[PDB]
Nucleic acid binder design. Structure first.
Length: 52
RNA sequence: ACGAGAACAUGCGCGACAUUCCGAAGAACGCUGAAGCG
């Protein structure tokens, strides 16, 4: 379904090492959504932040 | 007062008969209405 989350709808997170995948996802989210992740200085413990 | 004088290169006759512009051919191949959450 729709609204399952960022891990879902994205093959790359599973393939990348947890830390590498988290960094790449944070970079992508900051590139797209600058008003939430763009304001965040560092990578959060979990990327994306919220559970869907 | 000419190898001359008359004297239609003419008459009847259909460019016509038989013919399929057809034969073969997927508008389809891939494509999450989804991501962030303020």
């Amino acid at each position: 379904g729709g609204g399952t989350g960022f891990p879902s709808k994205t093959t790359h997170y599973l393939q990348k090492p947890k830390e590498q995948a988290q960094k790449d996802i944070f970079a992508i989210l900051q590139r797209r959504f600058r008003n939430v992740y763009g304001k965040m200085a560092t990578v959060p413990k979990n990327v994306p932040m919220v559970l869907k």
